[PDB]
Each structure stands twice: as structure tokens, then as C-alpha cells.
Amino acid sequence: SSLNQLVSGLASGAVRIVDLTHTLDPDFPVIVLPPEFGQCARFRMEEISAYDHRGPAWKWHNISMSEHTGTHFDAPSHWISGKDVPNGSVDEIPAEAFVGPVVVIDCSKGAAENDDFELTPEIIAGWESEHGRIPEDAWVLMRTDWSKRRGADYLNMRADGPHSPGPTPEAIRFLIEERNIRGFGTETVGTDAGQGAHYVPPYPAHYLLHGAGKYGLQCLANLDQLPATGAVLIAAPLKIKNGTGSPLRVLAMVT
Amino acid sequence: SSLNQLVSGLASGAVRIVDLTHTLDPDFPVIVLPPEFGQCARFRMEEISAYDHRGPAWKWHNISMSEHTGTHFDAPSHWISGKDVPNGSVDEIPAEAFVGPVVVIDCSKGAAENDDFELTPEIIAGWESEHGRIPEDAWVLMRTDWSKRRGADYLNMRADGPHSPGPTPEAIRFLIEERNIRGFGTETVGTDAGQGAHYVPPYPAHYLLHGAGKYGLQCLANLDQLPATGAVLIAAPLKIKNGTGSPLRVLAMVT
Ligand SMILES: Nc1ccccc1C(=O)C(=O)O
Ligand SMILES: Nc1ccccc1C(=O)C(=O)O
Ligand SMILES: [Mn+2]
Ligand SMILES: [Mn+2]
């Protein structure tokens, strides 16, 4: 069966697993919004005990964060457009959605030349002419190697806001309506471009994806280790009651 | 090759995904220790905004918990015996450890008759005469249907402590030394019996497993939906810096 052969492949090294997740720690940046809005929290952790009088033979921590901290998954209820879609929270999404085919569109050269680099319908058509049509219900990842930027360069906040690559409304509408993708993922802090508030509609990845009951992934790492096609993405969010998303361990299995 | 067949199976339903995770919520019980010690925290969440003046077009929460809250994963560094094993924290465990073969030993009839039901080497031997030798580097799950218990029955706290099924020290030692398992999982709050403090060594699942650089899973649900052999477990914990474990979405793929 396919499961027995996956086990054999993982055992022999014919199938490798790539970790697409940033480490959770207090220093990792989270999305920054205008100061009048409630803000996403950074990851924090505190010891309960560390093999001491509070717990002599064990070590463990309390942790705090937001649903949208670090490498994380966005459910449709995250956006106003996904308010009434079925199974809109992370605890309600059907489990078969958490494992599936993934395609990677390499936009890293574009991002290196332009902070606001745009994934367009034209780029998608060019990619498909080379790698074949995007299969239905696939995860689509926009590779930018943005995960290599550290410090203030990662959010890349300027006076007129953050500047980081992302999809145009037309690119997202195409993926949803013409390809019925499962979800869209980025190496940036958001599924939308840094300047994405200024598209029509505002935050089109969030508005259109979540309005269609589709999912988002953000702050992905190591996309440069993945093939354009043929890998399998594992992205199972925490089963948070009525959760709009959660941090998660994103993995890719590759041949 | 094998991944293409997995994709095909997942798409067609020839491969099904079983969700083994309890919902993360304030009311799900966590392990309780003697009062002089630091205690595991319950899951908590608060709204940042809900499509309102705090965040007009979006909804999201801040969340807090322990590494060992709910359906969760225990890394070797959790126990004093595994403090110094290489790759001992959840952020260091090789990603290939997160996907692999799983066997399910059905102890539900026993658990229904005895709150303190013990998984023994003899029971494991009986399981193997029926289902074949436990494969090396496999996840072993102790099924008890304990997850069907709600209210105070789940912790099953009495005047002399909690009473819930678990493995004997000899069982764990056998699985480690004679079968070289990857890890051990249960539907109860701990990988150890409720009365596991009174074994030698105290809490032997933790002491022995984590001492051997092996992993734990706790509070699993729906084990009664899995085959004894043939399934693949997906158990990828959060990439917490120096983390001793984390809540996670545990899944099984079944043919
Ligand atoms: N929470 C948000 C609010 C406004 C704009 C964007 C976002 C995100 O990118 C997010 O989902 O983390
Ligand atoms: N953290 C503990 C401390 C003492 C005994 C048991 C435990 C656990 O079961 C656990 O790892 O969740
Ligand atoms: Mn998000
Ligand atoms: Mn634990």
C-alpha cells in the first residue's frame, strides 16, 4: 500500500522530511498593525520547574503567544469575509486538509530585486507552462527566501508601512476560482504583501482565501529546499476551540 | 513515486486521515501533581479583536497554556534522565521522527474492568503473537478508550491520587531495549499510570523513555478508529526554543 511504501521510504532515506518552521522564541517578529488596533503578541515562555524544588525530576514551561505568532496557519474565521463559511475555525476544518500536494513557485530572484515583489496571474501561467497545471486542492507556496532576512529587515517597516512580497488580488482570485487551491503560503509575516492594505479588495489574500473557505500559511522557512512539484505538505494546526488559526509545525515530505 | 501514490490515495479517499486530537479548551483536564510542586496550566484564550473597533476586518486571539496541556508531545528533555540526550528538546528532534509507523495495542476491555490497568511485557507478547513483532522505530499506542470518559472521570482523582491505566516499568523497558520503539502514547493524561509515582523508577515511562531519547504522546483521542498495524502516525510538535514538549495536532493516516 502507499502507507507501507511511505514507511519504507522514510526508513531508507528515499523520502526525506524538510522542516518548514521557524523556532518559537521571544525575539521572532510578529505582524505589526496601526497602533489603534489590538496587536499580535510575541512568543513568551516561563519555567514551571527545571529539575528543582518546584519539580525535582522534570522540566516544563508555560507558554503564551497569539494564534498568529511565528510559523502559523490562518483559518477562514480569521477574516470578516470568512465569518459565515462552513468549518471556518481551526478545530472544525476537515483533517484531510492537513496533508496534501504542494507546489512551490520560486519568486526569490524577484524578491531580491524588489521588496514589494508581486505574484501575478502571468507568473502563474508561466510556472504552469513549465511545471504543469496546479492540481486541484493543492497548497501553493510563494517562495521568496524572505526567511533569510533577520532583524528589522524581516518586517521591513518603512514610514509608509511594511514592504514585503505578496500576491495580487488577480493572482489569488485565479488560484481560487480557476484552480480551487486548498491554500496559499509565504515566507513573509503575512499571506498578503506588506503593502496589501492598498489592493482592491484590501488584504486580498485574506479577503478572498478566507471568503472561499481556504487557508493561509505564513513565516515558512526553508522553501529553497523544496521541488516545484511532487512534495507533500503537512500542516496540521492546533485544535483550538473556535480558533482563527494557530502556530504549527509545518513539514514537507520530498523524494 | 511513493509520495505520488500517497497524494492519490489522500485525494481519492483510499487513504483516510484520522484526527487523534482533543479540542484545546479551558475545561480539558491537565495532569495534577502533589501541591508542593509547580502545576501544569490549563489552556486559556482571549480575543484581540472580533471584526470590531479593535480590528475591523479580522478576528484573532491571544492564547496561553503549558507545553504539557491537552493532546501533547513529550520530548526527552522533559525528564531529568533525558536532560542531556542529543536532540533532546522539541526544537531539536529530527523531522523524520514526526512521521512513522504506529501500532495500536487494545487494552480497552482491561481498562474498563480496572482503573489501574497495567500494560505488561506479557500483554505485549500476546499482542505480537497476533499482529507480528513490533517493528523497530515504531510509535506504540496504548488504547484504553479512556478518552470516552468525561467530567472528573477522566483524571479519575481519588483520595490517594489519580487512577488510570498505564505501562509497567518492565513493559517500557521491554519496548525500549527489546524492540527499540520511537515513542509511547496514551489516551490518559500521562504516558505513565495514574499511580505511576509508586513504580520503580518513579514515573517509569518518563524516566525510561526520555532517558533513552524516546518520545511520549498523551491525551490521544479516537484510538478505537485505528487498525492494530498498518497506519502512519503524524506527530509534529511546535518548534519551541528549548521546549520540553508542546500541544500538537496528532493525526493518523489509515488505508
Ligand atoms: N491579523 C491581520 C490583521 C490585519 C491585516 C493582516 C493580518 C494578518 O496578516 C494575519 O492574519 O496574521
Ligand atoms: N510533568 C510531569 C511531572 C511529574 C509527573 C508526570 C508528569 C507528566 O506526566 C507530563 O510530562 O505531562
Ligand atoms: Mn495569520
Ligand atoms: Mn507531557
Author numbering:
A (entry chain B), B (entry chain A): 2 to 256
Paper text:
The structures of LaIHA:benzyl benzoate and LaIHA:isatinate were determined at 1.50 Å and 1.79 Å resolution, respectively, while the one of RsIHA was determined at 2.65 Å resolution. Asp75 forms a bidentate contact in LaIHA:Benzyl benzoate and a mono-dentate electrostatic contact in the LaIHA:isatinate structures. Additional stabilization of the moiety into the product is obtained by the deprotonation of the nucleophile OH− group by His79 to produce a carboxylate group chelating the Mn2+ as observed in the crystal structure. The strong exothermic isomerisation step (−10 kcal mol−1) yields a structure of isatinate with a strong intra-molecular H-bond between the amino and the α-carbonyl groups.
The highly conserved Mn2+ binding site is located at the bottom of the substrate-binding pocket.
